[model samples]
Target: SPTKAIVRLREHINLLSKKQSHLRTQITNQENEARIFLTKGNKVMAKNALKKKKTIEQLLSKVEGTMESMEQQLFSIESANLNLETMRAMQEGAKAMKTIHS
Candidate 1:
């Protein structure tokens, strides 16, 4: 049950991680764009790009902690899979015993 909660938490965390990674990529692109804008003396556009980068950095703090814990999630998924398989085997054994009793 705790692991199920963890599984759910991990799913949400993975989504956040993906969003964070996307934001970082967007920030990189914006930084490059800002450089181009500054080269052309478009000071206003360059400032706007810098602002966008700062916003992304702020949002990144939210998911950064989740990313650290996500590394252990694969182990939980593997354990859940093993438990499912064990349950299925036990069910099959019970069915065989019932058939023999009949």
Candidate 2:
């Protein structure tokens, strides 16, 4: 159950990460288009491309922020789960040792 929550969080993180990467690619493409238009002396088209880039960049920033938060939550969940599992293992070992002594 604990691991499942971590797994779901990881999935969300992965989706968000991929979305961010896709947005970055779009931004790069827009930048390249803007550069080409600038070289061609098409100021209007270049400005449009720049505007698109700016919009995509803003969306990317939001996605990145969400991804960071999800990652932090996942880390906390994993750390706590590790501690719980470790404590359980230690308790079993202690019980086994006690049985041996008896």
Q: Top lDDT: which candidate number?
A: 2
Residue by residue across 26-64, what tens digits does model 1's lDDT show? 889889888999999998999998998788777777568
Alpha-carbon local distance difference test for all models: 0.81, 0.95
Per-residue lDDT of candidate 2, residues 1-102 (tens digit): 878888998899899999999999999999999999999999899999999999999999999999889889889999998999999999999999999999
Give candidate 1's whole-model lDDT.
0.81
Candidate 2 runs further than 4 Å off? 85-102
lDDT against true structure, model 2: 0.95
Each candidate structure's TM-score, on Cα atoms with residue i matched to residue i, is: 0.59, 0.77
